[PDB]
C-alpha cells in the first residue's frame, strides 16, 4: 500500500469481537483512538453484537448521533470509537453503566456497575516524562496525559482517576502481592496476586502471578495491569472472578447447572 489502510476484513478482525464469517466481507475498522486496533472493542460491536439494542449499523448511527452513549464521562457520536480496557460506557436513558473488563475467556464481558462506581476508572501508566519547564507529565494505557501527578507514581503503576474532572485520587504501586488483571496473551482476563517480577535487561521482563485457587501462571510484564491493593480489588469483578476454570471443570459445571436449574 502507498498510504494508510481504511478498511478491515471480517476474517482479519481480532478474534475476541466474535464477529461471524457470513454477514459481510468487512468488519468495522476502529476509528483511531486511545486503545490499539487489536485491544479495543468498537462501540457498534458493544451495541448491536453484545447488548443487542440495535440490529444493523444504521441503527447504531440512530442511537449514537442522539448523543446517549457516554464512554468514560464524554459523549461519543462515532459508531467505530475504540472503547477499550476499564473504559465506562454510560447509556443514560436506560440508567445503565458498563465497565469494559476482560472475561477470563479472552473476550470483553458486558459488566454492569453502580453509577456511584461509574464516576471513577483505573488507568495503567505507560511512562513518565518531565515536560517543557520541569512539569512532570504522565501517559496512561488510554493515553490520558496527566500533568503534575504525585511524585511517588512510577512507570508500571495504576491511578484511580475521577471521570468528571480527570484528576488522580489514589495510585497502586507495582509491588509483589498486589492483584493483577492480565490484559494480553494466552492469560488474557486472568486475575491473581503478583508473586515475582523477573528482570531481563534488554529483553522483556516476565512477571509470575499466583491465582486465587493457587493455579500459578506467568506473563510478559507489558500485558499485566494491577486492579487492587493485596487481595481487595478497586473495581467490581465480572462473575468467575478471573480464574479460568478448565474445559473439564466448565463441562461438569455446565452439566451441574443444566440439571440443577432445569
Amino acid at each position: 500500500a502507498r498510504g494508510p489502510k481504511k478498511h478491515l476484513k471480517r476474517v482479519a478482525a481480532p478474534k475476541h469481537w466474535m464477529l461471524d464469517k457470513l454477514t459481510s466481507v468487512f468488519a468495522p475498522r476502529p476509528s483511531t483512538g486511545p486503545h490499539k486496533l487489536r485491544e479495543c472493542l468498537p462501540l457498534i460491536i458493544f451495541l448491536r453484537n453484545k447488548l443487542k439494542y440495535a440490529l444493523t449499523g444504521d441503527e447504531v448511527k440512530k442511537i449514537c448521533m442522539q448523543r446517549f452513549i457516554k464512554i468514560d464521562g464524554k459523549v461519543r457520536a462515532d459508531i467505530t470509537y475504540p472503547a477499550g480496557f476499564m473504559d465506562v460506557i454510560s447509556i443514560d436513558k436506560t440508567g445503565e453503566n458498563f465497565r469494559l473488563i476482560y472475561d477470563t475467556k479472552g473476550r470483553f464481558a458486558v459488566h454492569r456497575i453502580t453509577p456511584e462506581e461509574a464516576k471513577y476508572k483505573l488507568c495503567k501508566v505507560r511512562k513518565i516524562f518531565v515536560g517543557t519547564k520541569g512539569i512532570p507529565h504522565l501517559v496512561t494505557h488510554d493515553a490520558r496525559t496527566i500533568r503534575y501527578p504525585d511524585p511517588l507514581i512510577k512507570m508500571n503503576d495504576t491511578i484511580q482517576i475521577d471521570l468528571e474532572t480527570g484528576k488522580i485520587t489514589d495510585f497502586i504501586k507495582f509491588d509483589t502481592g498486589n492483584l493483577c488483571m492480565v490484559t494480553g496473551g494466552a492469560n488474557l482476563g486472568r486475575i491473581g496476586v503478583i508473586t515475582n517480577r523477573e528482570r531481563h535487561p534488554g529483553s522483556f521482563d516476565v512477571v509470575h502471578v499466583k491465582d486465587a485457587n493457587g493455579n500459578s501462571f506467568a506473563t510478559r510484564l507489558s500485558n499485566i495491569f494491577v486492579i487492587g491493593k493485596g487481595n481487595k480489588p478497586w473495581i467490581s469483578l465480572p462473575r468467575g472472578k478471573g480464574i479460568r476454570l478448565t474445559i473439564a471443570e466448565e463441562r461438569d459445571k455446565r452439566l451441574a447447572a443444566k440439571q440443577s436449574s432445569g
Binding site: 464469517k21 474445559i247 473439564a248 463441562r251
Partner: protein
C-alpha cells in the same frame, strides 16, 4: 472477496478394490437388511465409523489421566451413548473399537420407524419418511439418515397432519370418494 463459506467435505470414501466379491456381497447384505439405496449410503456410515475409530486410536496412544484425553474421550463416549450405539454400562473407549456398521444402521430413522412397528417393512419405512408421514417431538422429518438420539427414540410416531394420524385424508381417497359420489349419482 465475498461473504460465502466454501467449507465442505466428503462424507464417504470409495473402496480401493472395486470388485472384492466378499465386500460387494457383504455391502449388499447390509443394503437388503436395512433398506438403503446405494453403496454411498453404506460407505457414508463406514466413513463416520472410521473417523470415530481414527479418533479412538489417537486417544489410546495418550497416557491415562491426560487432561486432553479425559476431556476428548468422555466427549466421544457421551456422544456414542447419546445416539444409542454404545451402552451407559460399557462407556469405556476400548469398547469403541469393538463397534461396527450395524450399530449405526440400527439408529437411523428408517430402521427405528420399522422396528417400532408403525411401518410394515424397511422399504415401506423410507416411503413413510420420504412422504413426510412420521415426526420426532412435533418435527416432521423428511429424511431417513436422521440418527435417533436415545432419549428421542420414544417420540417417533405419525404426524398429526398425516392421514395415518388424525390428519386431512389424502389425495387418492378424496378423489375416489368424489368419484364414488360421481359414480352413485
Amino acid at each position: 472477496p465475498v461473504a460465502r463459506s466454501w467449507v465442505c467435505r466428503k462424507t464417504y470414501v470409495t473402496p480401493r478394490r472395486p470388485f472384492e466379491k466378499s465386500r460387494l456381497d457383504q455391502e449388499l447384505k447390509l443394503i437388503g437388511e436395512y433398506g438403503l439405496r446405494n453403496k454411498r449410503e453404506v460407505w457414508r456410515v463406514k466413513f463416520t465409523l472410521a473417523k470415530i475409530r481414527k479418533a479412538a486410536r489417537e486417544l489410546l496412544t495418550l497416557d491415562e489421566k491426560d487432561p486432553r484425553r479425559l476431556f476428548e474421550g468422555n466427549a466421544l463416549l457421551r456422544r456414542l451413548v447419546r445416539i444409542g450405539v454404545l451402552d451407559e454400562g460399557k462407556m469405556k473407549l476400548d469398547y469403541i473399537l469393538g463397534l461396527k456398521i450395524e450399530d449405526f444402521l440400527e439408529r437411523r430413522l428408517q430402521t427405528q420407524v420399522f422396528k417400532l412397528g408403525l411401518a410394515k417393512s424397511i422399504h415401506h419405512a423410507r416411503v413413510l419418511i420420504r412422504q413426510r408421514h412420521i415426526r420426532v417431538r412435533k418435527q416432521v422429518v423428511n429424511i431417513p439418515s436422521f440418527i435417533v438420539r436415545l432419549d428421542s427414540q420414544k417420540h417417533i410416531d405419525f404426524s398429526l397432519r398425516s392421514p395415518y394420524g388424525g390428519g386431512r385424508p389424502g389425495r387418492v381417497k378424496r378423489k375416489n370418494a368424489k368419484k364414488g359420489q360421481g359414480g352413485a349419482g
